[PDB]
Amino acid sequence: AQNPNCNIMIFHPTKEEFNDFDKYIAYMESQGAHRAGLAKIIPPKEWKARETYDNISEILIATPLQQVASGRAGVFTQYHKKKKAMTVGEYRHLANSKKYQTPPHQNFEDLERKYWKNRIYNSPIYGADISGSLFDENTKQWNLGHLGTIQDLLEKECGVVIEGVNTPYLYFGMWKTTFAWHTEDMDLYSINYLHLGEPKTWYVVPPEHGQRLERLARELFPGSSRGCGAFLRHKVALISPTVLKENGIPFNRITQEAGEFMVTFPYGYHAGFNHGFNCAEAINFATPRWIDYGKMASQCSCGEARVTFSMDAFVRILQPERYDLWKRGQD
Ligand SMILES: O=C(O)CNC(=O)C(=O)O
Numbered sequence: 001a002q003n004p005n006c007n008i009m010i011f012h013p014t015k016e017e018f019n020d021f022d023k024y025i026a027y028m029e030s031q032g033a034h035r036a037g038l039a040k041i042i043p044p045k046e047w048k049a050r051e052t053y054d055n056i057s058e059i060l061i062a063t064p065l066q067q068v069a070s071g072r073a074g075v076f077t078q079y080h081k082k083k084k085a086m087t088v089g090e091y092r093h094l095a096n097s098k099k100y101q102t103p104p105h106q107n108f109e110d111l112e113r114k115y116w117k118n119r120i121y122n123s124p125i126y127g128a129d130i131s132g133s134l135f136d137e138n139t140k141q142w143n144l145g146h147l148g149t150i151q152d153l154l155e156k157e158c159g160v161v162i163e164g165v166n167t168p169y170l171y172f173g174m175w176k177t178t179f180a181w182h183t184e185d186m187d188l189y190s191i192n193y194l195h196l197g198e199p200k201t202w203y204v205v206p207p208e209h210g211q212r213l214e215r216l217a218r219e220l221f222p223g224s225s226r227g228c229g230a231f232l233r234h235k236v237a238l239i240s241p242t243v244l245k246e247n248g249i250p251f252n253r254i255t256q257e258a259g260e261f262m263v264t265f266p267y268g269y270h271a272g273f274n275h276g277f278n279c280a281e282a283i284n285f286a287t288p289r290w291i292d293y294g295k296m297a298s299q300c301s302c303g304e305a306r307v308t309f310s311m312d313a314f315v316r317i318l319q320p321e322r323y324d325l326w327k328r329g330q331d
């Protein structure tokens with residue numbers, strides 16, 4: 001078995017190896033990368049996502065989210081308060097303000113210590129989930145707006161033709177902006193490219209150990225657990241590395257820097273935070289190996305997680321028993 005200790009693997013494809021996305025994913029899995037839940041891909045030195053970022057300030061963040069925390073430093077939830085629209089130029093200036101900027105620090109480890117010590121006492125503003133792409137249309141390799149669609153994968157593997165589309169999303173972050181513990185919708189893959197700015201630290205639980213994270217989460221968030229059988233789908237819960245270590249949960253951590261890709265694998269729980277002003281682009285995708293994870297994915301039926309038009313069809317085809325009760329949550 002390759003990668004038996006489920007370590008995060010880092011890949012350095014050549015420009016020749018960067019031509020065939022699907023084949024490269026299958027390569028990485030042949031080396032055991034999926035066992036970690038997360039992998040890093042450093043693009044060939046010749047590759048670029050676009051020529052410059054000089055003209056992005058006029059993108060609109062229509063609903064910036066203020067991430068308000070409750071709990072204790074190592075075990076907290078966050079609620080997203082909607083703010084007034086602002087441009088990316090306005091958001092960058094805010095991120096750089098004395099109130100919101102990254103503190104002085106020695107290295108990524110000291111900054112990580114400061115994040116876990118101090119996150120709950122601040123409410124950073126996250127520009128999340130903005131439909132769009134920053135890849136130049138002439139970028140042919142690993143262009144997250146040109147990937148094969150999940151609906152076409154389901155058709156190729158299973159023969160069934162379904163409605164829905166699959167498009168990327170932009171994330172504009174600042175110091176302390178946080179992504180809660182989650183797997184992807186329908187336990188899909190994700191791919192995430194850090195276009196610019198400061199790093200993003202990731203934490204991940206190997207897929208084979210995901211249920212250990214879930215059991216700890218039910219103990220740490222007991223009222224949420226009683227309310228919903230898949231409450232991590234709400235994407236509000238945070239648990240620190242120290243707490244995970246105290247409870248014996250297997251995990252790994254890695255920091256992504258600008259110019260690098262991360263891939264999350266089916267049923268790889270992940271969480272993390274941004275070090276400062278940055279912009280990431282991410283999209284879900286599928287492979288043949290995903291299908292069985294999609295059939296088994298948990299779902300929120302309390303109604304809080306409230307998810308996409310395209311997820312309807314996935315549920316309808318892969319989980320026809322759940323269909324009914326799940327669309328009651330989504331209607
Ligand atoms: O970058 C972020 O805030 C969150 N991204 C993801 O969870 C992802 O790419 O799967």
Ligand SMILES: [Mg+2]
Pocket residue numbers: 055056057058059
């Ligand atoms: Mg612009």
Ligand code: NI
Pocket residue numbers: 182183184190264270
């Ligand atoms: Ni994710």
Ligand SMILES: [Zn+2]
Pocket residue numbers: 227228229230231233234300301302303304305
């Ligand atoms: Zn729910």
